[PDB]
Amino acid sequence: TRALKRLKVVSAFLQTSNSPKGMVLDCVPVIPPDLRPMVQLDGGRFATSDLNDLYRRVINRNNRLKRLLDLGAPEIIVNNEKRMLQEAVDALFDNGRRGRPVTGPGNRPLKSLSDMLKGKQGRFRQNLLGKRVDYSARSVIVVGPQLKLHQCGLPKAMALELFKPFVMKRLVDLNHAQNIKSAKRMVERGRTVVYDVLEEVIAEHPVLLNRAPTLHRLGIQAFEPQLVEGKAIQIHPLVCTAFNADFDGDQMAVHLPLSAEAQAEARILMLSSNNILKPADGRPVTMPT
Amino acid sequence: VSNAKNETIPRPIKASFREGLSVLEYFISTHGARKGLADTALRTADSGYLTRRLVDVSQDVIIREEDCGTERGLKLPIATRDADGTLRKAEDVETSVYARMLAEDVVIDGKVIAPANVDLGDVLIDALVAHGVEEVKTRSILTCESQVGTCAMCYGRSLATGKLVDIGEAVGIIAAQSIGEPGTQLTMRTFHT
Amino acid sequence: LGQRAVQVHLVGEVQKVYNSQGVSIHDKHIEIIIRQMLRRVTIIESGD
Amino acid sequence: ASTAPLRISFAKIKEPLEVPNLLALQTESFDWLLGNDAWKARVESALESGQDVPTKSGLEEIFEEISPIEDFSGSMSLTFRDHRFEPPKNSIDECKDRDFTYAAPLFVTAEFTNNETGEIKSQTVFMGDFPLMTNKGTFVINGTERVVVSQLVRSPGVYFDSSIDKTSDKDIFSAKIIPSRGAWLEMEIDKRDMVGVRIDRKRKQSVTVLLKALGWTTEQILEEFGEYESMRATLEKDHTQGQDDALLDIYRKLRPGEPPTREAAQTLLENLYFNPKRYDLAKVGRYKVNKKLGADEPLDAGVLTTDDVIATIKYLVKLHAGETETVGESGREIVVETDDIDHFGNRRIRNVGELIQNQVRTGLARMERVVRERMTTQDVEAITPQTLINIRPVVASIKEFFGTSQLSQFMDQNNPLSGLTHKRRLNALGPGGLSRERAGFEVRDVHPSHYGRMCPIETPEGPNIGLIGSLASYGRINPFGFIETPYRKVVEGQVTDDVDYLTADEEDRFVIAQANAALGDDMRFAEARVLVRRRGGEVDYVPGDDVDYMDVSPRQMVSVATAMIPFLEHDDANRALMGANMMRQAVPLIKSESPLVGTGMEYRSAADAGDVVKAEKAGVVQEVSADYITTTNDDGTYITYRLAKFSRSNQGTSVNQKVIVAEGDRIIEGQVLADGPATENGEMALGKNLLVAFMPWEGHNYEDAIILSQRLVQDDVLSSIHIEEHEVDARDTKLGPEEITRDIPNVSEEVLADLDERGIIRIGAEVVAGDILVGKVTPKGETELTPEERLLRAIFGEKAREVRDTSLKVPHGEIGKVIGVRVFDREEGDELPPGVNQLVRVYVAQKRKITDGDKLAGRHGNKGVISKINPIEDMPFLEDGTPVDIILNPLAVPSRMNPGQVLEIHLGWLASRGWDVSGLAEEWAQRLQVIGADKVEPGTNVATPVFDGAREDELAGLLQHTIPNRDGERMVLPSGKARLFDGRSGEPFPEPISVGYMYILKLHHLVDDKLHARSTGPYSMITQQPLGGKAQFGGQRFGEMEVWALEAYGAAYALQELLTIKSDDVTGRVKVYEAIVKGENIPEPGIPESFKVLIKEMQSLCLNVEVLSSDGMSIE
Amino acid sequence: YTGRGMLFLDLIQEGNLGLIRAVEKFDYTKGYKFSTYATWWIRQAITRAMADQARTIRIPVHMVEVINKLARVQRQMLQDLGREPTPEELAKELDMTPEKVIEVQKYGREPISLHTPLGEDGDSEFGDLIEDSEAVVPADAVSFTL
Amino acid sequence: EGIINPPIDELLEATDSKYSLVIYAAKRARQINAYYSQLGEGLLEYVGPLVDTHVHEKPLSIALREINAGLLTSEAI
Amino acid sequence: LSAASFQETTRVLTDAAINAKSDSLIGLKENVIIGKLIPAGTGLSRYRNIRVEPTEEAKAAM
Amino acid sequence: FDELRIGLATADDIRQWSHGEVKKPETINYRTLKPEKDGLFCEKIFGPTRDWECYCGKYKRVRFKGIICERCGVEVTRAKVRRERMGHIEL
Ligand SMILES: [Mg+2]
Ligand SMILES: [Zn+2]
Ligand SMILES: [Zn+2]
| Residue among D372, D371, D367 nearest D72 (CA) | D372
H or E element at residue D941: none
Q: Smallest Cβ distance to G16: which of H2, H3, H6?
A: H6
Cβ within 8 Å, pair A124-G5: yes
- CA D6, distance to chain mean position in Å, is 33
Degrees, nearest 5: CA angle D351-D353-D356: 105
CA distance H41 to G54: 59
Strand pairing partners for D864? D856
Please give the full DSSP string across chain H, using - where no structure is assigned: --EEE--B--HHHHHHH-SS-------B-TTT--B-SSSTT-TTTS--SSTT--SSSS--SSSS-S-B-TTT--B---GGGGGT---EEE-
Distances (CA, A) of D378 to D72, D381, D388, F3: 14, 9, 9, 90
Q: Where are the alpha helices (DSSP H) in D180-298?
A: 207-213, 218-225, 229-237, 243-254, 262-269, 283-293
Q: Does H88 touch chain A (CB under 8 A)?
A: yes
Cβ-proximal residues to F1 (8 Å cutoff; 6+ apart), any chain = none
CA distance D112 to D68: 10
| Residue among D181, D200, D150 nearest D286 (CA) | D181
H or E element at residue E125: none
Cβ within 8 Å, pair D865-A142: yes
CA distance D441 to D444: 6
H or E element at residue D720: strand D719-731
Give A253 Cα–ligand 1 centroid separation in angstroms: 15
Termini Cα distance of chain G? 53
H or E element at residue A36: none
Strand pairing partners for A228? A155
Helices (H) then strands (E): counts for chain D = 31, 50
Q: Does E52 touch chain A (CB under 8 A)?
A: no
B156: helix, strand or coil: coil
Beta strand D468-470 with D425-427: parallel, antiparallel or unpaired? antiparallel
CA A232 to chain F, closest CA, distance in angstroms equals 22
A interface mutation test: which of D851, D1012, D1024, D1069 has the most A CBs within 10 A? D1012
Flag whether H42 is marked binding.
no
| Residue among A41, A94, A101, A102 nearest E5 (CA) | A102
For B126, how many CA atoms within 13 A lie in the half-sphere containing its CB? 3
Please give the full DSSP string across D203-216, using - where no structure is assigned: SEEEHHHHHHHTT-
CA distance D1022 to G55: 52
CA closest to D452 among chain B residues:
B27
Q: What is the CA radius of gyration of chain G?
A: 21
Cβ-proximal residues to D1096 (8 Å cutoff; 6+ apart), any chain = A31, A32, A35, H83, H84, H86
Cβ-proximal residues to E62 (8 Å cutoff; 6+ apart), any chain = none
Q: Smallest Cβ distance to D1110: which of H2, H7, H8?
A: H2
Q: Does H10 touch chain G (CB under 8 A)?
A: no
Chain G contact partners (≥3 CB pairs within 8 A):
A, B, D, F, H
Chain H contact partners (≥3 CB pairs within 8 A):
A, D, E, G
Q: Smallest Cβ distance to D392: which of E75, E119, E132?
A: E75
How big is chain C, counted in residues? 48
What resolution in angstroms does the PDB record give? Answer: 3.4
- D119-131 sheet: strands from edge to edge: D76-85, D103-114, D119-131
E145: helix, strand or coil: helix
Give B156 Cα–ligand 2 centroid separation in angstroms: 9
Q: Does A268 touch chain F (CB under 8 A)?
A: yes
Say if CB G27 and CB G16 are below 8 A apart: no
The torsion angle over the Cα atoms of residues D201, D202, D206 and D210, rounded to 10 degrees, is -100
Helices (H) then strands (E): counts for chain E = 6, 1
Q: Which amino acid is at B113?
A: I
Strand pairing partners for B168? none
Residue D639 — φ and ψ, nearest 5°? -135, 135
Q: Do chain D and chain A touch with ≥3 beta carbon pairs under 8 Å?
A: yes
Strand pairing partners for D823? D840
DSSP designation for A280: T
Residue A29 — φ and ψ, nearest 5°? -70, 155
- CA B193, distance to chain mean position in Å, is 28
Q: Smallest Cβ distance to G40: which of D1052, D1086, D1094?
A: D1052
CA distance D463 to G24: 42
CA distance D653 to A106: 39
Q: SS3 sequence, D637-680?
A: CEEEEECCCCCCCCCCCCCCCEECCCCCCECCCCCEEEECCCEE
Cβ within 8 Å, pair D1064-A270: no
Flag whether A196 is marked binding.
no
For D362, how many CA atoms within 13 A lie in the half-sphere containing its CB? 12
Say if CB D82 and CB D122 are below 8 A apart: no
CA distance G52 to D265: 92
D170: helix, strand or coil: strand
D177: helix, strand or coil: strand
Say if CB D547 and CB D509 are below 8 A apart: no
H or E element at residue A114: none
Cβ within 8 Å, pair A130-D1017: no
Beta strand D8-9 with D76-85: parallel, antiparallel or unpaired? unpaired
Flag whether B68 is marked binding.
yes
CA distance B137 to B117: 11
Q: Does C42 touch chain B (CB under 8 A)?
A: no
Give A32 Cα–ligand 3 centroid separation in angstroms: 21
Those residues whose beta carbon sits under 5 angstroms from the ion ligand 3 are H 54, 56, 58, 69, 71-72
Termini Cα distance of chain H? 35
Q: Where are the alpha helices (DSSP H) in D658-812?
A: 711-714, 787-795
CA distance D488 to D498: 6
CA closest to A207 among chain F residues:
F3
DSSP designation for B150: B
| Residue among D360, D388, D394, D386 nearest D372 (CA) | D388
CA A97 to chain E, closest CA, distance in angstroms equals 19
Cβ-proximal residues to E146 (8 Å cutoff; 6+ apart), any chain = A179, A180
Cβ within 8 Å, pair G22-H1: no
Q: SS3 sequence, D3-39?
A: CCCCCEECCCCCCCCCCCCCCHHHHHHHHHHHCCHHH
Q: What is the largest CA-CA distance in chain H?
A: 49
For D576, how many CA atoms within 13 A lie in the half-sphere containing its CB? 29
| Residue among D478, D527, D65, D466 nearest D303 (CA) | D65
Look up the domain containing D214 and give its range: 154-349
Burial classification of residue H79, based on how many CB atoms lie within 10 Å of its CB (0-12 exposed, 13-18 middle, 19 or more buried): middle
CA distance D576 to D456: 11
Q: Smallest Cβ distance to G25: which of H4, H6, H7?
A: H4
Cβ within 8 Å, pair E141-D404: no
Give B61 Cα–ligand 1 centroid separation in angstroms: 35
| Residue among D892, D896, D903 nearest D996 (CA) | D903
CA B23 to chain C, closest CA, distance in angstroms equals 34
Residue D395: Cβ within 10 Å count: 16
Beta strand D683-684 with D679-680: parallel, antiparallel or unpaired? antiparallel
Cβ within 8 Å, pair F30-D1081: yes
Cβ-proximal residues to D914 (8 Å cutoff; 6+ apart), any chain = D936, D937, D938, D939, D940, D962, D963
CA distance D689 to D678: 14
| Residue among D402, D326, D391 nearest D363 (CA) | D391
Please give the full DSSP string across A126-171, using - where no structure is assigned: HHTSSEE-SSEEEEEEEE-TTS-TTB--EEHHHHHHHTHHHHHHHH
Chain A residues in contact with C24 by the CB 8 A cut-off are 280-281, 283
Cβ-proximal residues to D55 (8 Å cutoff; 6+ apart), any chain = D43, D47
Residue D854: Cβ within 10 Å count: 28
D826: helix, strand or coil: coil
D877: helix, strand or coil: strand
Give H31 Cα–ligand 3 centroid separation in angstroms: 20
| Residue among D975, D1001, D828, D826 nearest D909 (CA) | D975
Beta strand A154-155 with A227-228: parallel, antiparallel or unpaired? parallel
Say if CB D431 and CB D451 are below 8 A apart: no
Say if CB B113 and CB B131 are below 8 A apart: yes
Q: Directed axis angle between helix D416-424 and helix D601-608, to 10°? A: 80
Q: Does A220 touch chain B (CB under 8 A)?
A: no
Burial profile C3-42: b = 16 or more Cβ within 10 angstroms, e = fewer: eeeebbebbeebbeebeeeebbbbbbbbbbbbbbeeeeee
Cβ within 8 Å, pair A215-B158: no
Report the CATH number at residue D162: 3.90.1110.10
Long-range pairs of D492-496 with CB within 8 A, sequence gap ≥ 24: D492/D545, D493/D524, D493/D525, D493/D544, D493/D545, D494/D522, D494/D523, D494/D524, D495/D519, D495/D523, D495/D525, D495/D550, D496/D523
H or E element at residue B115: none
Cβ within 8 Å, pair G59-F20: no
Give D401 Cα–ligand 3 centroid separation in angstroms: 50
Distances (CA, A) of D151 to D353, D430, D467: 11, 7, 10
Q: Smallest Cβ distance to B159: which of A213, A217, A277?
A: A277
Report helix, strand and coil shares of chain G as percent, to nearest 5: 45, 10, 50
Cβ within 8 Å, pair A260-D1081: yes
Q: How many CB pairs under 8 A join E and H?
A: 18
Give E135 Cα–ligand 3 centroid separation in angstroms: 25
Distances (CA, A) of A176 to A181, A195, F57: 13, 12, 19
Q: Directed axis angle between helix A75-93 and helix A50-70, to 10°? A: 160
Report helix, strand and coil shares of chain C as percent, to nearest 5: 60, 0, 40
Cβ-proximal residues to H77 (8 Å cutoff; 6+ apart), any chain = H47, H48, H52, H65, H66
CA distance D111 to B125: 101
Q: Does B105 touch chain G (CB under 8 A)?
A: no
CA distance A175 to A165: 16
Q: Do chain G and chain F touch with ≥3 beta carbon pairs under 8 Å?
A: yes
Q: Does B61 touch chain C (CB under 8 A)?
A: yes
Burial profile D907-924: b = 16 or more Cβ within 10 angstroms, e = fewer: bbbbbbbbbebeeeeeeb
Residue F8: Cβ within 10 Å count: 17
CA distance D147 to D138: 5
Q: Do chain B and chain E touch with ≥3 beta carbon pairs under 8 Å?
A: no
CA distance D486 to D515: 12
How big is chain G, counted in residues? 62
Cβ-proximal residues to D929 (8 Å cutoff; 6+ apart), any chain = none
CA D729 to chain B, closest CA, distance in angstroms equals 45
Q: What is the largest CA-CA distance in chain G?
A: 67
CA distance D970 to D974: 9
Q: Does G53 touch chain F (CB under 8 A)?
A: yes
Degrees, nearest 5: CA angle A117-G13-D1037: 35
Cβ within 8 Å, pair A204-F33: no
Distances (CA, A) of D366 to D181, D396, D490, E4: 16, 11, 53, 15
Torsional sign, CA A172, A176, A181, A187: negative
Long-range pairs of D1070-1074 with CB within 8 A, sequence gap ≥ 24: D1070/E136, D1070/E138, D1070/E141, D1070/E142, D1072/A258, D1073/A165, D1073/D1016, D1073/E138, D1073/E139, D1073/E141, D1073/E142, D1074/E138, D1074/E141, D1074/E142, D1074/E145
CA distance D149 to D206: 43
CA distance A64 to A88: 13
Flag whether B154 is marked binding.
yes
Beta strand D977-978 with D808-809: parallel, antiparallel or unpaired? unpaired
Residue B93: Cβ within 10 Å count: 17
Residue D787: Cβ within 10 Å count: 7
CA distance D654 to D721: 6
Beta strand D8-9 with D942-943: parallel, antiparallel or unpaired? parallel
Report the CATH number at residue D744: 2.40.50.150
Beta strand D808-809 with D772-774: parallel, antiparallel or unpaired? antiparallel
CA closest to B63 among chain G residues:
G40
Q: Smallest Cβ distance to D1091: which of G28, G35, G41?
A: G35
CA distance D228 to D206: 16
